[PDB]
Amino acid sequence: SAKIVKPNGEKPDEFESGISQALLELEMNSDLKAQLRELNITAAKEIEVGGGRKAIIIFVPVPQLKSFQKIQVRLVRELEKKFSGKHVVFIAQRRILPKPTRKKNKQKRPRSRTLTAVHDAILEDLVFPSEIVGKRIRVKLDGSRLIKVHLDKAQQNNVEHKVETFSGVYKKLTGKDVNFEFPEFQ
Amino acid sequence: PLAKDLLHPSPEEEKRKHKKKRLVQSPNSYFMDVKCPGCYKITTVFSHAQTVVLCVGCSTVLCQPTGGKARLTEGCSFRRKQ
Amino acid sequence: GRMHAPGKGLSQSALPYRRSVPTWLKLTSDDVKEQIYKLAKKGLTPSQIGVILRDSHGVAQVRFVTGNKILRILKSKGLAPDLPEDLYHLIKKAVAVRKHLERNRKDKDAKFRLILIESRIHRLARYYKTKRVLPPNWKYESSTASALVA
Amino acid sequence: MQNDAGEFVDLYVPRKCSASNRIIGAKDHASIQMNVAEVDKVTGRFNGQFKTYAICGAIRRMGESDDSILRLAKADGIVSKN
Amino acid sequence: VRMNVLADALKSINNAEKRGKRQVLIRPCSKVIVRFLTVMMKHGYIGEFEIIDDHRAGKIVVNLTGRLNKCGVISPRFDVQLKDLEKWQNNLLPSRQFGFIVLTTSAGIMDHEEARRKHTGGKILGFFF
């Protein structure tokens, strides 16, 4: 509801009349001072998983995505307190550059910002509190493939309900379905 | 043994192979916390050390590098971390 | 296979899967770079920079902390050496063989080894003269090879 | 074998091994076809019908027929379920 | 020293299907050999196979069905035109009823029958039946 926490590269700001206001308002969390004063978010999508189970996502400028990791668990709790019945994830706006081809002086596309490295880097901030300890992409007998992501179970104690909204938000943003598994320690 | 499901091995069989050759490879190294006797300073020394690790204030020798896995000098306080 | 011995040895390091810094390493990118800027000025070389901050500092791999390699951050403001570290040690080891071979003329074994090391120098020198790490007129002269190594 | 007329033009359809899925030949004289007779649930006696398994001689001579016949009794509701 | 990675993988499948095994382990993964294997899985020779993602080159575990006769490779990637393709078929196929010489075109890694339903002669990449 204000132009401070939510900028863009462009003018449009639909569906942030309570979203950017949701983190203007809050008081006395751990790291209150170095968060409300200078950091910012970019955009938000309100997509669906399952049935009537909405999930607001936050698009983040990349150099301060690292500054959202050290306060994320003490930001998920407040944003889910205010927005009840709702899940909160943090995904960077990462800006795909197209694969060059036969068809001015464009210097070359860094592989940090390629389509393979983006659709991978979308996961390890999607599952922030559990990192990824394996990946077992498996083709489903008909050309359709399926990604099995193994999370660590050393921080299992928060990611139990978010796993089916993890696959739904990964399907809308990327286009490919996953499912998550919790294998034993090695 | 025509039907070993060689995508899901048991972790016991996973431990008793090479550090290469595994289904996903993973090293047999670890990091260990070592209290030298007589100081507050926890050391975070690597297991397969190659250097002679010295302590900062009470500057006695902590471990000895040897063949595979470093032998600690004194019987000392010691734990495997992470 | 091993290049100049018929060996089939499989013993080399295996990075783990997780690229992340562990939760106990409270040691920042600013601190590990300035440690590397300190003790590489104490005459140390990029293969032995990472070994002492693995053993006594817990930093598992500098690329997993800084996002950059060890020799890459030495060249970041110029205090990296002129010859590469691996070309330096073959040249240093070949001088030790050649000085040995002068007093020991009828050591026909070291005469066989001397061309195997010196072949590995020139095969690796032709790599760096294509990556423009070395100038194109750079030639391994055995006469001035003892002046390249200190 | 279903020509474009739609007719079966074939002397016989040979069996195939339930382990190695390959064809038992006409004179593979080590290929067994044996029956495993299931029981009823409540009293455990022979109820009349059975289940057949053909194990070809090439996979029988190799020596893991027992690994075979247990594995297809594991999958087909007979042995242990653990 | 692995000069061809499709040649090593498809040698490895061939030894275990005649050995009787239900799974193989293919140590390097490639984008040419996952598009190679979903030409024989689609025609119905192998089943579910998984790509094991590692940060270096991944592995592949293939579930063998038993319907495979031989899955070789034509090791120099020769060029084959659609005029020239018919004399490639009668050399290295057991019949004109079945089996596929799988060849990479500008429009994708295809069959030989997909290559002439399109008009897309290419480079021969391997064969399987």
XYZ file of C-alpha atoms in Angstrom:
629
model
C 0.000 0.000 0.000
C 3.050 2.253 -0.297
C 5.838 2.926 -2.781
C 8.762 2.240 -0.443
C 8.973 -1.516 0.108
C 7.713 -2.452 -3.376
C 9.528 -0.950 -6.377
C 9.666 -2.275 -9.931
C 11.595 -1.703 -13.076
C 8.206 -0.574 -14.368
C 5.061 1.161 -13.004
C 2.457 -1.615 -12.443
C 1.692 -2.544 -8.804
C -1.544 -4.623 -8.813
C -2.316 -6.823 -5.771
C 0.118 -5.206 -3.353
C -2.444 -3.017 -1.576
C -2.083 -5.270 1.451
C 1.014 -7.202 0.450
C 3.670 -4.488 0.559
C 1.782 -3.045 3.538
C 2.076 -6.436 5.295
C 5.790 -5.871 5.896
C 5.584 -2.122 6.457
C 3.533 -2.689 9.581
C 5.343 -5.276 11.658
C 7.327 -4.442 14.780
C 9.956 -6.050 17.056
C 11.101 -9.113 15.240
C 14.704 -10.207 15.286
C 16.353 -7.849 12.779
C 13.643 -5.202 12.680
C 15.973 -2.288 12.009
C 18.075 -3.513 9.079
C 15.014 -4.848 7.224
C 12.210 -2.263 7.211
C 14.539 0.635 6.386
C 16.398 -0.214 3.192
C 15.448 -3.602 1.721
C 12.629 -4.137 -0.739
C 10.678 -6.696 -2.758
C 9.641 -6.584 -6.403
C 6.446 -8.483 -7.258
C 3.972 -11.056 -6.015
C 1.809 -13.770 -7.512
C -1.257 -15.323 -5.876
C -1.489 -18.697 -7.642
C -3.385 -21.829 -6.646
C -2.374 -25.306 -5.481
C -4.598 -28.296 -4.695
C -8.074 -26.939 -4.079
C -8.841 -23.542 -2.632
C -5.309 -23.311 -1.211
C -3.764 -20.060 -2.317
C -0.064 -19.319 -2.012
C 1.321 -15.811 -2.240
C 4.889 -15.692 -3.521
C 7.385 -12.851 -3.249
C 9.636 -11.786 -6.099
C 12.913 -10.467 -4.781
C 15.807 -8.440 -6.222
C 18.702 -10.857 -6.355
C 21.574 -9.079 -4.490
C 19.419 -8.863 -1.345
C 17.984 -12.346 -1.689
C 20.927 -13.405 0.515
C 19.724 -10.814 3.017
C 16.282 -12.456 3.043
C 17.659 -15.904 3.927
C 18.890 -14.923 7.388
C 15.435 -13.579 8.344
C 13.157 -15.845 6.308
C 11.889 -18.141 9.053
C 11.187 -15.024 11.146
C 9.336 -13.582 8.169
C 7.301 -16.642 7.168
C 5.749 -16.713 10.641
C 4.621 -13.070 10.553
C 3.370 -13.140 6.963
C 1.413 -16.318 7.692
C 0.111 -14.763 10.915
C -1.245 -11.781 8.990
C -2.225 -13.803 5.912
C -3.799 -16.853 7.495
C -4.563 -19.950 5.476
C -1.686 -18.995 3.225
C 1.886 -20.011 2.406
C 4.920 -17.805 1.825
C 7.876 -18.510 -0.481
C 10.719 -16.335 -1.763
C 11.837 -16.627 -5.389
C 14.221 -14.274 -7.169
C 13.406 -12.494 -10.390
C 16.274 -13.954 -12.364
C 15.780 -12.694 -15.980
C 16.305 -15.478 -18.549
C 18.279 -14.453 -21.589
C 17.397 -16.290 -24.808
C 19.627 -18.874 -26.406
C 21.456 -17.213 -29.322
C 21.163 -18.726 -32.755
C 21.782 -18.128 -36.465
C 19.084 -15.473 -36.575
C 23.647 -5.207 -32.087
C 26.946 -6.175 -30.456
C 25.545 -8.493 -27.792
C 28.281 -9.604 -25.445
C 27.810 -13.177 -24.389
C 25.134 -14.670 -22.113
C 26.587 -15.694 -18.729
C 25.703 -19.224 -17.750
C 24.602 -17.922 -14.349
C 21.657 -16.470 -16.228
C 20.733 -19.354 -18.519
C 17.533 -21.368 -18.555
C 19.064 -24.526 -17.128
C 20.767 -22.715 -14.271
C 17.667 -20.633 -13.504
C 15.141 -23.499 -13.264
C 17.643 -25.177 -10.918
C 18.355 -22.090 -8.796
C 14.597 -21.634 -8.390
C 14.584 -24.713 -6.126
C 17.303 -24.068 -3.567
C 15.675 -20.815 -2.485
C 12.167 -22.325 -2.806
C 13.121 -24.983 -0.271
C 15.116 -22.528 1.806
C 15.211 -24.144 5.290
C 15.942 -27.596 3.850
C 18.729 -27.698 1.268
C 18.789 -30.325 -1.503
C 20.765 -33.527 -0.917
C 19.919 -35.282 -4.175
C 17.978 -35.105 -7.387
C 16.623 -38.111 -9.264
C 14.893 -36.835 -12.417
C 13.012 -39.834 -13.872
C 11.219 -40.098 -17.225
C 7.633 -41.385 -17.069
C 7.632 -43.912 -19.943
C 5.982 -41.417 -22.351
C 8.431 -38.537 -22.785
C 7.126 -36.743 -19.686
C 9.805 -36.484 -17.013
C 9.489 -36.147 -13.256
C 11.924 -34.617 -10.773
C 12.381 -36.277 -7.379
C 14.059 -33.872 -4.963
C 15.632 -35.252 -1.797
C 15.633 -32.867 1.146
C 17.963 -33.184 4.067
C 15.784 -34.135 7.134
C 18.232 -32.250 9.358
C 15.703 -29.416 9.198
C 12.644 -31.523 8.458
C 10.812 -29.938 11.430
C 9.291 -27.093 9.351
C 8.693 -28.502 5.861
C 5.946 -31.056 6.169
C 2.850 -29.245 4.899
C 4.467 -27.080 2.215
C 5.538 -29.958 -0.020
C 2.461 -30.022 -2.256
C 2.459 -26.254 -2.610
C 6.168 -26.546 -3.413
C 5.347 -28.619 -6.498
C 2.481 -26.357 -7.526
C 4.512 -23.167 -7.341
C 7.299 -24.919 -9.202
C 4.880 -25.960 -11.913
C 3.502 -22.478 -12.558
C 6.847 -20.679 -12.534
C 8.811 -23.269 -14.506
C 6.426 -25.682 -16.239
C 7.621 -29.044 -14.895
C 6.274 -31.125 -12.030
C 8.212 -32.431 -9.055
C 7.607 -34.423 -5.909
C 9.677 -34.299 -2.764
C 11.131 -37.123 -0.718
C 12.769 -37.373 2.695
C 15.529 -39.987 2.540
C 17.668 -41.198 5.390
C 21.021 -39.719 6.374
C 24.138 -41.116 4.713
C 21.600 -61.420 -8.439
C 19.600 -60.388 -11.512
C 17.394 -57.905 -9.660
C 19.565 -55.763 -7.460
C 17.654 -52.474 -7.405
C 20.764 -50.467 -8.036
C 19.111 -47.087 -7.592
C 18.163 -47.709 -3.936
C 21.073 -49.333 -2.087
C 21.130 -49.797 1.648
C 23.336 -47.279 3.485
C 25.464 -50.138 4.865
C 26.436 -51.199 1.339
C 26.819 -47.512 0.510
C 29.359 -47.104 3.312
C 31.456 -50.120 2.274
C 32.283 -49.036 -1.294
C 34.853 -46.638 -2.675
C 34.321 -42.926 -2.243
C 34.020 -42.869 -6.014
C 31.915 -45.639 -7.675
C 28.892 -44.805 -5.511
C 25.421 -43.984 -6.767
C 26.063 -40.407 -5.665
C 29.586 -39.853 -4.544
C 30.333 -38.571 -1.079
C 33.613 -38.280 0.772
C 34.710 -40.246 3.807
C 36.247 -37.134 5.321
C 34.642 -35.165 8.122
C 35.389 -32.250 10.397
C 35.987 -32.682 14.086
C 35.985 -30.372 17.104
C 38.949 -30.836 19.432
C 39.352 -29.291 22.884
C 43.037 -29.081 23.669
C 43.487 -29.840 27.398
C 43.840 -26.551 29.238
C 42.119 -23.886 27.160
C 38.749 -22.619 26.002
C 39.750 -22.790 22.337
C 37.733 -25.314 20.376
C 39.664 -26.214 17.221
C 37.785 -27.163 14.043
C 40.500 -29.382 12.584
C 39.976 -31.444 9.413
C 40.138 -35.226 9.805
C 42.676 -36.152 7.106
C 45.056 -33.390 8.082
C 48.383 -32.997 6.315
C 49.756 -30.157 8.424
C 50.908 -30.122 12.027
C 48.162 -28.166 13.762
C 49.338 -25.859 16.543
C 47.158 -24.145 19.111
C 47.069 -20.366 19.418
C 47.593 -19.406 23.053
C 48.743 -22.618 24.718
C 50.834 -23.363 21.657
C 51.358 -27.097 22.003
C 50.999 -29.485 19.065
C 47.461 -30.779 18.507
C 47.637 -33.474 15.801
C 50.169 -35.332 13.673
C 49.710 -35.957 9.948
C 50.040 -39.620 9.067
C 49.032 -42.009 6.274
C 45.297 -41.710 5.779
C 43.774 -40.104 8.848
C 45.533 -37.732 11.251
C 46.561 -39.112 14.661
C 45.813 -36.683 17.487
C 48.787 -36.214 19.801
C 47.246 -36.237 23.264
C 44.259 -38.242 24.347
C 41.992 -35.224 24.163
C 38.388 -34.066 24.055
C 36.950 -34.728 20.665
C 33.673 -34.839 18.737
C 32.386 -35.098 15.172
C 30.488 -32.055 14.020
C 27.785 -30.791 11.633
C 45.952 -43.845 -17.288
C 48.992 -42.189 -15.717
C 50.891 -40.290 -18.391
C 54.511 -41.444 -18.073
C 54.038 -44.576 -15.989
C 51.785 -47.553 -16.783
C 49.695 -46.991 -13.668
C 45.937 -47.243 -13.276
C 45.683 -45.540 -9.924
C 42.248 -44.371 -8.798
C 42.828 -42.042 -5.852
C 41.533 -38.489 -6.146
C 39.298 -36.157 -4.189
C 35.505 -36.298 -4.474
C 33.552 -33.129 -3.729
C 30.278 -33.759 -1.869
C 26.891 -32.871 -3.273
C 25.882 -29.845 -1.170
C 27.527 -26.646 -2.427
C 26.446 -24.715 0.686
C 28.585 -23.552 3.594
C 27.797 -25.627 6.726
C 25.926 -24.020 9.606
C 28.922 -24.018 11.943
C 31.222 -22.035 9.652
C 30.688 -18.535 10.976
C 33.557 -17.233 8.878
C 32.693 -14.720 6.217
C 33.783 -14.112 2.628
C 35.492 -10.902 3.728
C 37.512 -12.730 6.374
C 38.656 -15.676 4.271
C 39.806 -13.438 1.416
C 41.896 -11.267 3.713
C 43.409 -14.371 5.281
C 44.393 -15.518 1.786
C 45.764 -12.042 1.068
C 47.801 -12.320 4.279
C 49.371 -15.755 4.038
C 49.932 -15.805 0.292
C 52.199 -12.844 0.951
C 54.101 -15.230 3.243
C 55.467 -16.992 0.171
C 52.763 -19.633 -0.268
C 51.306 -21.055 -3.452
C 47.659 -21.725 -4.429
C 47.852 -25.495 -4.015
C 49.007 -24.983 -0.414
C 46.740 -22.049 0.363
C 43.688 -24.276 0.464
C 45.375 -27.050 2.391
C 46.136 -25.027 5.532
C 42.758 -23.324 5.653
C 41.222 -26.746 5.260
C 43.197 -28.249 8.120
C 43.188 -25.382 10.629
C 40.330 -23.139 9.500
C 37.527 -25.515 8.499
C 36.934 -23.807 5.136
C 36.138 -26.834 2.988
C 36.582 -25.160 -0.405
C 37.110 -21.476 -1.113
C 34.881 -21.552 -4.190
C 32.011 -22.647 -1.916
C 32.521 -19.552 0.243
C 33.696 -16.772 -2.072
C 32.341 -18.024 -5.378
C 35.894 -17.765 -6.707
C 38.929 -20.009 -6.843
C 42.176 -19.431 -4.997
C 44.427 -18.471 -7.921
C 41.544 -16.406 -9.270
C 41.527 -14.115 -6.233
C 45.309 -13.793 -6.196
C 45.222 -12.407 -9.720
C 42.341 -10.103 -8.661
C 44.754 -7.283 -7.838
C 47.985 -8.648 -9.259
C 49.916 -10.450 -6.510
C 49.802 -13.861 -8.220
C 53.106 -15.250 -9.616
C 54.284 -15.074 -13.223
C 54.732 -18.748 -13.998
C 51.840 -21.023 -13.064
C 52.262 -23.166 -9.993
C 52.249 -26.499 -11.813
C 54.694 -25.372 -14.502
C 56.921 -24.046 -11.733
C 57.253 -27.365 -9.952
C 58.069 -29.360 -13.073
C 60.791 -26.835 -13.912
C 62.088 -26.939 -10.337
C 62.111 -30.728 -10.337
C 63.786 -30.952 -13.744
C 66.666 -28.757 -12.573
C 67.234 -31.105 -9.628
C 67.465 -34.076 -11.988
C 69.762 -32.275 -14.419
C 72.152 -31.060 -11.720
C 72.235 -34.628 -10.411
C 72.934 -35.990 -13.879
C 76.124 -33.937 -14.329
C 77.976 -35.626 -11.484
C 76.351 -39.007 -12.245
C 77.043 -39.535 -15.927
C 76.596 -43.312 -15.964
C 73.182 -42.996 -14.273
C 71.277 -44.162 -17.328
C 68.010 -44.320 -15.377
C 67.940 -40.600 -14.644
C 68.772 -39.906 -18.277
C 65.549 -41.712 -19.143
C 63.580 -39.817 -16.526
C 64.999 -36.456 -17.573
C 63.289 -36.513 -20.947
C 59.992 -37.662 -19.447
C 59.782 -34.695 -17.084
C 61.009 -32.333 -19.778
C 58.418 -33.639 -22.189
C 55.715 -32.918 -19.622
C 57.027 -29.368 -19.294
C 56.749 -28.678 -22.999
C 53.334 -30.335 -23.405
C 52.031 -28.123 -20.617
C 53.907 -25.074 -21.891
C 52.102 -25.365 -25.189
C 48.826 -25.205 -23.261
C 49.616 -21.927 -21.523
C 50.958 -20.360 -24.707
C 47.521 -20.915 -26.252
C 45.617 -19.577 -23.246
C 47.893 -16.486 -23.396
C 49.142 -17.216 -19.887
C 52.604 -17.280 -21.264
C 53.965 -15.024 -24.003
C 54.405 -16.644 -27.437
C 58.193 -16.246 -27.440
C 58.500 -18.089 -24.136
C 60.786 -21.099 -24.456
C 62.045 -23.560 -21.874
C 65.805 -23.227 -22.175
C 67.620 -25.667 -19.924
C 70.514 -23.207 -19.676
C 68.407 -20.450 -18.093
C 65.993 -22.838 -16.380
C 67.929 -22.465 -13.123
C 67.258 -18.712 -13.334
C 63.497 -19.157 -13.669
C 63.326 -21.198 -10.491
C 64.575 -19.239 -7.495
C 1.464 -63.552 -36.445
C -1.124 -61.150 -37.871
C -0.495 -60.511 -41.539
C -2.266 -57.615 -43.243
C -5.200 -59.914 -43.939
C -5.511 -60.212 -40.171
C -4.823 -63.941 -39.863
C -2.659 -66.060 -37.553
C 0.030 -67.562 -39.805
C 2.289 -69.420 -37.387
C 2.960 -73.005 -36.323
C 2.821 -72.191 -32.609
C 3.490 -69.359 -30.209
C 6.507 -70.434 -28.130
C 6.688 -69.844 -24.435
C 8.882 -67.201 -22.923
C 10.758 -67.329 -19.645
C 9.178 -65.485 -16.764
C 12.650 -64.420 -15.541
C 14.668 -63.404 -18.600
C 11.703 -62.767 -20.959
C 13.481 -64.646 -23.776
C 11.976 -67.359 -25.904
C 12.202 -71.010 -24.960
C 13.207 -72.784 -28.157
C 11.730 -75.968 -29.538
C 14.511 -78.163 -28.125
C 15.680 -76.218 -25.084
C 15.456 -79.347 -22.956
C 16.403 -77.583 -19.716
C 13.399 -75.247 -19.708
C 11.069 -76.181 -16.909
C 7.383 -75.458 -16.666
C 6.283 -76.156 -13.109
C 3.274 -75.250 -11.015
C 2.972 -73.490 -7.670
C -0.348 -74.385 -6.065
C -1.935 -71.745 -3.887
C -4.204 -72.487 -0.943
C -7.371 -70.969 0.398
C -7.101 -68.319 3.108
C -8.835 -69.694 6.149
C -7.702 -73.332 6.379
C -4.533 -73.712 4.273
C -5.201 -76.702 2.003
C -4.965 -77.133 -1.745
C -8.036 -75.600 -3.336
C -7.663 -76.965 -6.836
C -6.008 -74.344 -8.983
C -2.367 -73.362 -9.274
C -0.023 -70.954 -11.033
C 2.469 -71.819 -13.746
C 5.971 -70.477 -14.297
C 8.277 -71.253 -17.198
C 11.992 -70.790 -16.555
C 14.185 -71.142 -19.612
C 17.229 -73.381 -19.567
C 19.665 -70.609 -20.458
C 18.701 -68.710 -17.300
C 18.366 -72.005 -15.423
C 21.908 -73.181 -16.182
C 23.245 -69.806 -15.023
C 22.099 -70.758 -11.547
C 19.667 -68.146 -10.226
C 16.388 -69.930 -10.872
C 15.732 -69.699 -7.138
C 16.285 -65.951 -7.231
C 13.831 -65.989 -10.127
C 11.009 -68.138 -8.725
C 11.097 -66.380 -5.380
C 10.996 -62.952 -7.010
C 7.868 -63.721 -8.992
C 6.283 -65.307 -5.938
C 7.182 -62.139 -4.033
C 5.395 -60.082 -6.675
C 2.443 -62.454 -7.114
C 1.068 -62.772 -3.574
C 2.644 -65.886 -2.044
C 5.781 -65.776 0.039
C 6.404 -63.199 2.780
C 5.532 -59.488 2.231
C 8.450 -58.187 4.322
C 39.821 -41.693 -22.465
C 36.237 -42.058 -23.636
C 36.136 -41.057 -27.286
C 32.418 -41.756 -27.652
C 29.963 -41.753 -24.775
C 26.972 -43.150 -26.707
C 29.187 -46.045 -27.783
C 30.143 -46.914 -24.207
C 26.623 -46.637 -22.808
C 24.986 -48.730 -25.489
C 27.724 -51.337 -25.241
C 26.870 -51.495 -21.567
C 23.145 -52.075 -22.149
C 23.844 -54.863 -24.621
C 25.987 -56.934 -22.255
C 23.425 -57.016 -19.460
C 20.345 -57.787 -21.542
C 22.001 -61.009 -22.688
C 23.227 -61.535 -19.107
C 19.634 -61.496 -17.865
C 19.844 -58.386 -15.688
C 16.937 -56.116 -14.899
C 18.911 -52.890 -14.404
C 22.050 -51.299 -15.812
C 24.162 -48.384 -14.587
C 25.299 -45.940 -17.250
C 28.033 -43.817 -15.772
C 28.055 -40.661 -17.959
C 24.782 -39.062 -18.882
C 24.316 -36.882 -21.926
C 21.592 -35.069 -23.771
C 22.277 -37.243 -26.790
C 21.806 -40.487 -24.819
C 18.643 -39.464 -23.034
C 17.137 -38.611 -26.371
C 18.597 -41.853 -27.665
C 16.946 -43.930 -24.943
C 13.570 -42.264 -25.391
C 13.396 -43.595 -28.924
C 13.609 -47.191 -27.790
C 11.491 -46.659 -24.674
C 8.852 -45.101 -26.907
C 8.988 -47.989 -29.342
C 8.771 -50.194 -26.293
C 12.150 -51.807 -25.660
C 13.179 -50.446 -22.258
C 11.014 -49.129 -19.492
C 11.308 -46.464 -16.819
C 14.808 -45.044 -16.598
C 16.044 -42.442 -14.140
C 18.629 -39.705 -14.527
C 20.774 -39.417 -11.408
C 21.565 -35.713 -11.140
C 25.029 -34.962 -9.927
C 26.953 -31.739 -10.424
C 29.416 -33.468 -12.708
C 28.061 -35.662 -15.510
C 25.141 -37.692 -14.246
C 24.334 -41.393 -14.258
C 21.454 -43.337 -15.820
C 19.737 -46.452 -14.471
C 17.667 -48.265 -17.090
C 14.968 -50.842 -16.385
C 15.441 -53.563 -18.991
C 12.316 -55.343 -20.188
C 13.830 -58.187 -22.219
C 12.499 -57.165 -25.646
C 15.929 -56.011 -26.867
C 18.006 -57.944 -29.397
C 20.951 -55.606 -30.036
C 21.519 -51.895 -29.398
C 24.757 -51.070 -31.203
C 26.256 -47.839 -32.500
C 27.599 -46.708 -35.878
C 30.716 -45.158 -34.542
C 31.750 -42.682 -37.253
C 28.681 -40.464 -37.461
C 28.343 -40.864 -41.207
C 26.101 -38.613 -43.210
C 23.062 -40.274 -44.747
C 20.755 -38.713 -47.326
C 17.196 -39.853 -47.926
C 18.336 -41.153 -51.285
C 21.109 -43.025 -49.464
C 19.000 -44.270 -46.536
C 17.426 -47.316 -48.195
C 20.798 -49.032 -48.593
C 21.472 -48.331 -44.928
C 18.260 -50.137 -43.977
C 18.906 -53.475 -45.627
C 22.466 -53.684 -44.294
C 22.033 -53.356 -40.544
C 18.444 -54.259 -39.894
C 17.380 -57.873 -39.447
C 14.183 -57.235 -41.385
C 11.903 -54.653 -42.932
C 9.277 -55.496 -40.311
C 11.108 -54.059 -37.301
C 14.169 -52.378 -35.880
C 15.236 -48.772 -36.214
C 18.323 -46.939 -37.367
C 18.132 -43.809 -35.237
C 19.707 -40.763 -36.786
C 20.101 -37.147 -35.756
C 18.500 -34.593 -38.071
C 18.249 -30.830 -38.031
C 14.724 -31.308 -36.660
C 15.751 -33.709 -33.875
C 16.963 -37.205 -33.106
C 14.512 -39.435 -34.902
C 13.864 -42.884 -36.332
C 14.468 -43.853 -39.889
C 10.702 -43.942 -40.401
C 10.275 -40.567 -38.726
C 13.087 -39.318 -40.959
C 11.104 -40.058 -44.107
C 7.689 -39.079 -42.784
C 9.434 -35.748 -42.492
C 11.946 -34.879 -45.180
C 14.899 -34.772 -42.818
C 17.948 -36.810 -43.812
C 20.703 -36.405 -41.244
C 23.654 -38.085 -39.589
C 23.354 -41.699 -38.516
C 23.753 -42.024 -34.768
C 23.111 -45.665 -33.950
C 20.766 -48.566 -34.386
C 18.645 -50.749 -32.138
C 16.412 -53.761 -32.541
